[PDB]
Nucleic acid binder design. Sequence first.
DNA 1: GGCGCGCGCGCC
DNA 2: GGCGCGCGCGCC
Length: 190
Amino acid sequence: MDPLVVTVLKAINPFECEGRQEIFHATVATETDFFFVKVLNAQFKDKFIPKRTIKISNYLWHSNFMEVTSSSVVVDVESNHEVPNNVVKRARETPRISKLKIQPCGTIVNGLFKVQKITEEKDRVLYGIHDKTGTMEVLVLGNPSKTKCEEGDKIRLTFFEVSKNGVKIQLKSGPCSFFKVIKAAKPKTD
DNA sequence: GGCGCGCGCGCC
DNA sequence: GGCGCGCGCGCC
């Protein structure tokens, strides 16, 4: 609701997303917790640099994240706020699968995930991902992709959502998700 | 009392 | 940030 002073923890450079808005994603934190912010505005990037303190007014707050529009006001401010170490650590860490299983649809998920299997289709790709807590599926709609991922590689997800599909709970790409394939290193020939 | 879960922290 | 480990609380 009212203006909120937050400390910026992470922010990617803007990329073109879908109408056809240029946007970016950031992670910010108060003294108690962190949340991810989708900033529609793009102009706002110069204010979203890690460790800077910003005051944000006129924003939307949904079930999981915070939306910052061109109607919003982002003002750089000097603050004595300090983010506790573990709030930063949790803000930045990749959630476990067993933890993800019990989150509402629309919950924003970012992180780095080991993939065991890739079910390919010209309209979607399903990535079997795994950790020690379970297995899960990551649904990326509409690509070959150009990011060809083999087993043993990793996928870096930005702004995916927990999703229900009938029986199973997966991770779903949205229109403004970012997806990247992180390839396992090739042993070389001296 | 046992144990799982969330959380914190230290080592890599 | 990943990973492993201990602590405390709440449910059984």
